[PDB]
């Protein structure tokens, strides 16, 4: 529980869109809506390259399992596909009628889920880029989706309090996570086994739901998450820490064993919207929006 600040990955010109680690655990790269996907290192913040070649801003970039192929959820309503290795304009894939906010991958690295603001979860192809299907998801735009341990399920983060665990192959609603409240569900993800649900509803309270049973077990107190779609994570490299972004210029990292305030990290000057965990070692991604533009290497 002694994550120490190491370096600063300075250079961003707008609000940092995302800070996620590469699947090799060796490239904590980043991006923003300035058409500058700034590929940085992981241990010192060494510059590698910068992806450009869009029309409008960039919402989301997601990691393929070879740490190389990057799809861009760019705000020109395209799915422009780029590369850590080359950076060629591989496939520009239009189609969504509204802003493609988030994008993720199956663990098989052959599908492009597309969580856009157009209320239709369409699926796209890695090799060529055909609109594979179109999920009648919600009467709300999509903020976050995820696949399970293989890619057979799609969880939804709707805005009227619905987390429908969608099928992927046949593609129908299998289970709707029900709530009498209708909170704006921000960032859902499956557990790394695929059998538990962390529904990040915007009520200053994270919710760990079971997938088999379906009831909540543990929550968290004393954190500020109401407005932005603040990302949450899972960390087992040190303790059982839960890494999340902040709004009062902190780095929200607490334990499922504790559920309360036991460790805080600090130094940002804006709302931290994106956080991530190193899969093996104790490196934690922390970078805020436009009033910070810096990425802070916390390291135990």
């Amino acid at each position: 529980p002694n994550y120490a600040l190491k370096f600063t990955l300075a250079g961003h010109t707008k609000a940092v869109s995302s800070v996620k680690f590469s699947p090799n655990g060796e490239w904590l790269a980043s991006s923003s809506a300035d058409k500058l996907i700034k590929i940085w290192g992981a241990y010192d913040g060494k510059f590698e390259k910068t992806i450009s070649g869009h029309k409008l801003g960039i919402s989301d970039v997601a990691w393929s399992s070879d740490s190389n192929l990057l799809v861009s959820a760019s705000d020109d309503k395209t799915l422009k596909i780029w590369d850590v290795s080359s950076g060629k304009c591989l496939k520009t894939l239009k189609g969504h009628s509204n802003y493609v906010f988030c994008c993720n991958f199956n663990p098989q690295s052959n599908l492009i889920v597309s969580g856009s603001f157009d209320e239709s979860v369409r699926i796209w192809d890695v090799k060529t880029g055909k609109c594979l299907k179109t999920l009648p998801a919600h009467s709300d735009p999509v903020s976050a989706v995820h696949f399970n341990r293989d890619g057979s399920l799609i969880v939804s983060s709707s805005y009227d309090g619905l987390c429908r665990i969608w099928d992927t192959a046949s593609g129908q609603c299998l289970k709707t996570l029900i709530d009498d409240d209708n909170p704006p569900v921000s960032f859902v993800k499956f557990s790394p086994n695929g059998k538990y649900i962390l529904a990040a509803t915007l009520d200053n309270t994270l919710k760990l739901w079971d997938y088999s049973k379906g009831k909540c077990l543990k929550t968290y107190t004393g954190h500020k998450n109401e407005k932005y779609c603040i990302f949450a994570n899972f960390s087992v490299t040190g303790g059982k820490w839960i890494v999340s972004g902040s709004e009062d210029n902190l780095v929200y990292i607490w334990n499922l064993q504790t559920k309360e305030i036991v460790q805080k990290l600090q130094g940002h000057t804006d709302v931290v919207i994106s956080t991530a965990c190193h899969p093996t070692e104790n490196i934690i991604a922390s970078a805020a929006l436009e009033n910070d533009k810096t990425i802070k290497l916390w390291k135990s």
């Binding site: 055909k130 192959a169 046949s170 129908q172 299998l174 760990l208 077990l217 899972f234």
Partner: protein, 351 residues
């Protein structure tokens, strides 16, 4: 489960001759009139890979025990082991130019059984160019369909005269032999020998347009020269309906058979074996090939390049979208009440 309606098609490649799913059912190779190595993906319903191989219609295709090696048989006796990585030739020598079947041993991709048209079935090793010819009693039929079982124990060699002859995969042991007649006039030309995926319940297609279900366990119980009765006789009721191809389900539970006349296809089970649905089609279409998928109700229907697919029995309802909605069937009157008014540290990464 049992596929019902139209579902469209993937007619991306014409002149389609044969089609084969891999060990998991998840890949697909179609040799065509030119005989190319054309590969698909199924959830995308897209083409995976196209490799040109030859010019001839490649008839026989089979995957491997890992689902990563292949085999081919064109008109010019080209019988090599093929691959899914590069797909390159290994062996090629003389056979009679009509070739029916090659068949890997289901526990060894060394032992392969080559079945020509009017020749004895010949078992080849794939370590080298060795070949072992299985014995034929008649030598007047010259049409003895043979197949390994699902496990790898025995070879079931049956002539055109309804005579069964079982051989062991290495020592040719006649542990069982019999013959069948029904509505007894004479024997019947054996159309095909089949095998399921779960167990040993299997069937025989015969030229009387009647399909008789069997089981190798009672065959080995009677051993040689018993009277094995069929588990179930399957046929057409109103008409003749001559058959081109039959197949099990992905475990051997449903049994769906393809007619050779009408392009309107018939579905049965194994246990009951009821005609549950006639899958219709265009009358002006010639059915040529049928394939089935293990964990999905795919009907791969090659009809002269047209590969059309019918895949259903999934009908959407409510209470998964809105689980508060309790869909009654008829009018349910009731009163629900007889009086109308902890810290377990649970692992989240438990793999």
């Amino acid at each position: 489960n049992y596929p019902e309606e139209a579902d469209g098609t993937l007619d991306c490649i014409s002149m389609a001759l044969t089609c084969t799913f891999n060990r998991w059912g998840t890949l697909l190779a179609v040799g065509c009139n030119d005989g190319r190595i054309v590969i698909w993906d199924f959830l995308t319903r897209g083409i995976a890979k196209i490799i040109s191989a030859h010019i001839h219609p490649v008839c026989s295709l089979c995957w491997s025990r890992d689902g990563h090696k292949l085999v081919s048989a064109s008109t010019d006796n080209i019988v090599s082991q093929w691959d899914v990585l590069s797909g390159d030739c290994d062996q090629r020598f003389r056979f009679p130019s009509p070739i029916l079947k090659v068949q890997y041993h289901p526990r060894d991709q060394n032992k392969v059984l080559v079945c020509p048209m009017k020749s004895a079935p010949v078992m080849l090793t794939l370590s080298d160019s060795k070949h072992v010819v299985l014995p034929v009693d008649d030598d007047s039929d010259l049409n003895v369909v043979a197949s390994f079982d699902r496990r790898g124990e025995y070879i079931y060699t049956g002539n055109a005269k309804g005579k069964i002859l079982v051989l062991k995969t290495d020592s040719q042991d006649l542990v069982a032999s019999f013959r069948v007649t029904t509505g007894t006039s004479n024997t019947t030309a054996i159309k095909s020998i089949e095998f399921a995926r779960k167990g040993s319940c299997f069937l025989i297609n015969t030229a009387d347009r009647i399909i008789r279900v069997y089981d190798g366990r009672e065959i080995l119980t009677c051993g040689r020269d018993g009277e094995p009765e069929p588990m179930q006789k399957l046929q057409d009721l109103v008409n003749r309906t001559p058959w081109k191809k039959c197949c099990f389900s992905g475990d051997g539970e449903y049994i769906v058979a393809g007619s050779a006349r009408q392009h309107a296809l018939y579905i049965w089970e194994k246990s009951i074996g009821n005609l549950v649905k006639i899958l219709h089609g265009t009358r002006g279409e010639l059915l040529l090939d049928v394939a089935w998928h293990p964990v999905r109700p795919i009907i791969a229907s090659i009809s002269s390049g047209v590969v059309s697919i019918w895949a259903q029995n999934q009908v959407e309802n409510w209470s998964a979208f809105a689980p508060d909605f309790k869909e009654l069937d008829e009018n349910v009157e009731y009163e629900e009440r007889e009086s109308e008014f902890e810290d377990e540290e649970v692992d989240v990464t438990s793999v």
